[PDB]
Amino acid sequence: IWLKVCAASDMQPGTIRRVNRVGAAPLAVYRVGDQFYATEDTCTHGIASLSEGTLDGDVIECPFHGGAFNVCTGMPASSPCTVPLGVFEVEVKEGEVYVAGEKKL
Amino acid sequence: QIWLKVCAASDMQPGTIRRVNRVGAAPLAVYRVGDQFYATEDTCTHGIASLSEGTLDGDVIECPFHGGAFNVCTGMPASSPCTVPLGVFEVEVKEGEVYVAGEKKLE
Amino acid sequence: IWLKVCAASDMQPGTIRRVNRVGAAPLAVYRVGDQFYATEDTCTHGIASLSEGTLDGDVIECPFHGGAFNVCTGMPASSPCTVPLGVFEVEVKEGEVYVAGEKK
Amino acid sequence: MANVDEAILKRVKGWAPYVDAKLGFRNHWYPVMFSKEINEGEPKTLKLLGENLLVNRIDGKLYCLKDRCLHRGVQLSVKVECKTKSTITCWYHAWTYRWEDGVLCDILTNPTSAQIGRQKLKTYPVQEAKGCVFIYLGDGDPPPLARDTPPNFLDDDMEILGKNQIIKSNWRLAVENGFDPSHIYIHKDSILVKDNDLALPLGFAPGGDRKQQTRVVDDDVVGRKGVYDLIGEHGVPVFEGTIGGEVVREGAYGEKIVANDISIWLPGVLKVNPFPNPDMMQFEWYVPIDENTHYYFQTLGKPCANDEERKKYEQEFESKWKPMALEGFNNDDIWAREAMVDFYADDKGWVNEILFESDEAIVAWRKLASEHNQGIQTQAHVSGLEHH
Amino acid sequence: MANVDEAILKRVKGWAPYVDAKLGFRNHWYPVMFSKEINEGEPKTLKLLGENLLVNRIDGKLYCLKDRCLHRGVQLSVKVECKTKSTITCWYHAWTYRWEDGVLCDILTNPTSAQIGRQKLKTYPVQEAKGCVFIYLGDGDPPPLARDTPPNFLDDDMEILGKNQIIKSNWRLAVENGFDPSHIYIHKDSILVKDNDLALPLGFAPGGDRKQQTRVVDDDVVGRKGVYDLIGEHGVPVFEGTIGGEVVREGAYGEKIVANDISIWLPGVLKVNPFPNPDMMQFEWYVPIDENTHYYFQTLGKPCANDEERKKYEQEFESKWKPMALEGFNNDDIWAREAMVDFYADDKGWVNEILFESDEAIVAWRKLASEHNQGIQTQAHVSGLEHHH
Amino acid sequence: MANVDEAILKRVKGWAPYVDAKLGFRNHWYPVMFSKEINEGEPKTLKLLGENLLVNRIDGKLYCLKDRCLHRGVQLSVKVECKTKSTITCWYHAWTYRWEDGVLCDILTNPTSAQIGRQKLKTYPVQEAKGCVFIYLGDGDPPPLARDTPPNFLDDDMEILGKNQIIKSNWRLAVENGFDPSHIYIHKDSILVKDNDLALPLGFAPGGDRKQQTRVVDDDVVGRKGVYDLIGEHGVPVFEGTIGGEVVREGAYGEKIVANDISIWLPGVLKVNPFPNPDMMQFEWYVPIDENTHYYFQTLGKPCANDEERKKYEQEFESKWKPMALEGFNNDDIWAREAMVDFYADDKGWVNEILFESDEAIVAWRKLASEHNQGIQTQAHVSGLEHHH
Ligand SMILES: c1ccc2c(c1)[nH]c1ccccc12
Ligand SMILES: c1ccc2c(c1)[nH]c1ccccc12
Ligand code: FES
Ligand code: FES
Ligand code: FES
């Protein structure tokens, strides 16, 4: 049900990490200080990889057009984005970070 | 009709404006700049606006329609689009009572 | 060879003096502080006289279009000037300003 | 929402929103054509409030989609491809949208695309009433149509007929030409005056009780918002024009009394009652197309209890009303609007205009529109909303 | 004032006002038409310095009113309604003004309006001289017309005839093309050269003494300000054009000597003497209509002592001078002006131009104009002057 | 450099330089006409990257000068005056330039001017290859032409034939449409598909990863920069278009397989191989003229070992390939490009576009273009580069 991403130690606060999932679309895990979050890697406004964007607090900015999303809620934060992002549950069990195989309900 | 009774000098705080409606004649505007009183026609010369509904900035009244303005003491235009001088009416206080002339100054 | 131009003191700091030469293009001598420099006088972008321009540090600004040159290297400092100015070495000896006879 | 230089908006404190609304007011209904002009399965194009739209009739019902593909921004109308009754396929990369909800349901160039079912093309509510096509150029479920229509336009017995065309002037210049009491001076030679034996003064001057002549409506049960200029009941009919005391022109001393009352209503529709005949009414819209143009949507209403009357009216309209009134009378309004373009084109006319007494009603309208409009259309609404 | 990007204006320190005067100089007299083109009660429209104007002749006298109703800013000329001999009524709401002082004297739609007698439409002085109509596009009492006319234009016996048209180029490009000693190269094949046996070089190059060829006039008693380019007496006629030392073109070796001296005067009028004949003079104005266009007001003057001579000159003007000179010679000046539009259109040409010696006269003009003009016409003058207290 | 709102450029981090390159990329070779279009001593005008240029053929060799006199900025072409075989003289004040190096060698109106030999009119390298005229719109010594041409275009046995015209769309819209894997849908009804029995799908259902969708070439022996469209390598061709599971359209089931090889190269030239027939190739340029227009320079290449084959090919070209392919097929590309103008005209489409899978090809090009172009042409290059110390 869950996937092993990395150790909380490997990620510095404010960094991003792309999670490739063979057979399915890629995910993006963001470390906002001490809390980890995960959403679809693909920007809902196109075909850009959010993991290649810029993270400012709990907001991720797409590299293609500057659209943005709240990595916690998945909701659009900056135009041109209008379609919410698919958010996936994350959990840190014993220093390591895990991400649910399917997006939360 | 020479002098029109407006109100007690007390009924007006510094930097305020009061409209004086006259029977059979155009309205006037009495302005209190500090402890001094001045008066002009109430209708902006650039249109049909009521200057008494405008903003008083020291001794300059700004029309609410287009932002034009006049010096309340001389009646001369202070801000565009106003170009026609306002008619000025003498004001005097007799025993704490404000009075405004019924006729404007000539020149 | 050298051309005796003037006495160092004949020029106030930050001023420019035009030096005419019979049968040759006029030159401009600049006094930057207590240092002296020389270049062709005609702006390379037209017919303007740089000696009637504005001196800012070691850069002379043409009065016509605002183009400019570094009076030391002669290289353009501001558009529309593109053709380098001719530079002439200068030497001050005994309070007298001398400028090279030919560009160098 | 920032369409005009801020220095100017700061100057017109009484109605800055109105001056800023160069593209019109968003979130209001607007008539753009007549029902008879749009047939089943034949998509039609038009621009409203700067936006390119496509209207189609499917099973008798109208649907409106923004005429701009989500992909590369081309107009679908360049080459219409309606492959199934309920959809339209962009001619470029075949992105396919449903007319009913605008959802991107298929993409022929890539049936596996992750965009399918995850993007939506903008749709706008469309309603037909009195043979007129109304489009709600706004967001969210629409308010009732009556809110944006003048009183009586929707009466069951009211038979509506009219014409529409594109005029080159901002919609506001049209509005202020129409709701103007003194502008009828330009209609003193219209063939309608003589030919219909109308009683028409050169101009309706302001009577003695101003607050009685102008009536601001903001208590209408349906939510209508507008202003009345009660010229006939409070204004003064000026029939003899003078210069230096000498009569130089006279109004028309006909027997037909018309234009008893005139009213302007958001989003910008004028009602003239009664006109062009004592037993009729005129309802005309000045619909914003872009900042330089508007639709001059003219309608004439006349009660009709039966077809025989509807036909008789239908004949009088084609043979007299339309030719003599809608055109013979109003054509002069067209170039009049055009004539004000230059003064207001740079937005500075809104500051330099020198108004007089009869403009009192127009001023009331500017304030009412500023206070009660449902939104300012901006160029960003046209290109795509922007925000950080 | 602020018609051009400040960064550019700061660069042209020698003549910023001139470069900024894209709309022309306010407070100067400008010819706009000939007297015979405006008859009694025949209102005529025209744009001068960017302002729409209406001119009318009442009892023989000319009057000029701004063609823009004070009310909603429409042009009164869309539908002229001169209800009475002394007034004009706007076709819109009937505001009525007096041609004599522009006073709003009546309002047919509201006879009791308080605006009546309390508003005034802008008026401009108009004056006829030598069959030409001059409008003083300025404020306050105008100066004598003489100040804005070239010497001799107003002489008692000087008979003036001409032609006028609208040319698509800014007025300054016209001025500089006219007061340009080297541009006559474009006229080497003009039919006037051969057909009038003119002696004309390919160009007048700078003489030996510059300050001697150019004469800045600012001490003229009538107040006129201008610059002379003494090409004939101080310049060098170049008759053999060479490339690599080889002769590829020669000027004209006719007997008639013309263009001894040329001078440009504010607000922008050129005087070529003598031209196009040894016994004639040419006076031409480049009047600013807007930033992209100007009136090319051409006049040819020739002394005439009586009607017989005046009529004789008129016949010659129509049969020879107009078609052979005004058109045959100056038509090339028209497309020459148009050819410089793109370069200066963005105002960048005033910085990127690469001038040579013969342009020294033009440079002198730029300075004189910048220093002695009577005001810079701005867009605000057109829309309505602005100012915050 | 800075042709677009800075707020937009800041948003397009993946390819800001490309979005900024409104006017095209400077320092690259561009085809502008065919050799047969310019004859000996007959100068021709054209605009490239917004610059007006003049091309002449002298002693069989081509020379290019900027069509703008240094003096007052007029186009020399308004009235061409080539007075000696090696020069061109401005029609205005006779400044004369050498076609060889653009040096101001003479001034007929002032032979002793100090400007002579002290100024230089901009010149650009010009090279003829495959019957096409290429101009290096750049500064300094030009690189080999092969750097800016697709592989095989310069092959010794490659016979090149083509057509050129001006199209109303920014050059980038033309490039992206040409390299767009899914734009094939607009060609479904082309006469070429039917008359040449071509197999043509409606599009492709992508297969494999993103990196596999294209092949970027960052360096060729000659420094070429380009991208290959590999969508068909692991992608599934779509021959039956469905809507709601219902078949509403079908691709073309012809037996001729073409376009197995599609690549776009800087400065903006597409290579489709083989096309329009299994034994030939298509190389087409989208040359920037100004911000709203480009040259659609089409060429078809076919190896030919002798003069007979070249003759036959030429006959095939004029009788079939030109009308059926170049026009019959690519005409739809022309209006497709025009259809995207409005959305990108305000530069906002670069932000609001909603791309899908096949656009990976376009994205790869935007990045390659952004990373390897040799310079951004700016409006300043057109009027005159600007810089204040
Ligand atoms: C006053 C009187 C009549 C009218 C008007 C104002 N505005 C109008 C607009 C259309 C038709 C008639 C009128
Ligand atoms: C030199 C020589 C003659 C003329 C000139 C400059 N500029 C002119 C303008 C009009 C008519 C003649 C001339
Ligand atoms: S693809 Fe992310 S904002 Fe457009
Ligand atoms: S009505 Fe007062 S400034 Fe216009
Ligand atoms: S003449 Fe010096 S910058 Fe132009």
Ligand code: FES
């Ligand atoms: S632009 Fe419509 S499907 Fe691509």
Ligand code: FES
């Ligand atoms: S616009 Fe002239 S009277 Fe109203």
Ligand code: FES
């Ligand atoms: S503009 Fe070419 S020589 Fe003067």
Ligand SMILES: [Fe+2]
């Ligand atoms: Fe009307």
Ligand SMILES: [Fe+2]
């Ligand atoms: Fe000339």
Ligand SMILES: [Fe+2]
């Ligand atoms: Fe194509």
